[PDB]
Design a binder for this molecule. Structure first.
Ligand SMILES: CCCCCCCCCCCCCCCC(=O)O
Ligand SMILES: C[N+](C)(C)CCO
Ligand SMILES: [Mg+2]
Length: 253
């Protein structure tokens, strides 16, 4: 009974804010996602050397910023000194919560199990009902659960051998959703993916769809064939997704 995530309307989140058009995991992309009609955003977080929760997808700042290094081995002053595009600086999770509408949804993907303690603290101060914690790393989710056992939680899946484990993980972690990549459709096949989703849903789990390439939502009408079987879609191109779902007559802009 979390009304922020349990809705009749499909939820659209911007991937890394809105990485199709604005610098990924930046405060600029977040505001733009919301103005384009997203319900919220998904971000990636790590813990800096001096114990601050910062936003970054990769384990080094190489690729999105003009500098080099591993953020887990750097401090926040060193990091706010990078440019991640369009003048934007690496934000902290606290900055993210100041920028967002107080009712906007936020999916925090924990990339760093060491960040779990601080993420749970910051979240408890910023209206946890609108937060989803997710991770590929079961031990990050288990650690998060030491500090917060009520926030909505999704398991990110990227390996086939994780799927049979889901009923026990749901128990151990109190999962709300399994967060599935559209890449599963080519890689394991549409029908096997469909039956796996159907089985997960029969366990009482909700479904979050994501992808590294929005083309996979639309090719072979992959997403349309899954209508009724997902609650949340994480899109790199928010405007395109918002328009598509309105064009099917299922989600009003
Ligand atoms: C409801 C669960 C069923 C779905 C199981 C699918 C398992 C994943 C297999 C494909 C992984 C592809 C991930 C590529 C993108 C990435 O890792 O960033
Ligand atoms: C970023 N996601 C939450 C969509 C999964 C990892 O790439
Ligand atoms: Mg992510």
């Amino acid at each position: 009974g979390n009304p922020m995530w349990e809705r009749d309307k499909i939820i659209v989140l911007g991937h890394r804010g809105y990485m199709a058009k604005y610098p990924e995991n930046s405060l600029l992309s977040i505001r733009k996602a919301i103005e384009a009609g997203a319900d919220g955003v998904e971000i990636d977080v790590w813990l800096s050397k001096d114990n601050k929760v910062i936003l970054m997808h990769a384990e080094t700042i190489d690729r999105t910023s003009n500098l080099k290094g591993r953020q887990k081995e750097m401090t926040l002053e060193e990091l706010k000194k990078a440019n991640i595009g369009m003048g934007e600086r690496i934000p902290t999770l606290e900055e993210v919560f100041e920028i967002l509408p107080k009712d906007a949804l936020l999916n925090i993907e924990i990339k760093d199990r060491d960040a779990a303690k601080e993420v749970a603290r910051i979240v408890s101060e910023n209206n946890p009902e609108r937060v989803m914690i997710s991770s590929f790393d079961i031990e990050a989710l288990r650690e998060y659960r030491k500090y917060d056992d009520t926030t909505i939680m999704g398991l990110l899946v990227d390996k086939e051998e994780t799927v049979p484990l889901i009923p026990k993980l749901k128990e151990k972690l109190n999962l709300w959703s399994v967060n599935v990549p559209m890449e599963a459709i080519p890689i394991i096949g549409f029908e096997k993916t469909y039956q796996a989703i159907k089985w997960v849903r029969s366990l009482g789990l909700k479904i979050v769809l994501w992808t590294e390439d929005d083309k996979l939502f639309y090719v072979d009408e992959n997403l349309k064939r899954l209508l009724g079987m997902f609650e949340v879609v994480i899109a790199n191109d928010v405007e395109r997704m918002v328009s598509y779902l309105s064009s099917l007559g299922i989600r009003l802009e």
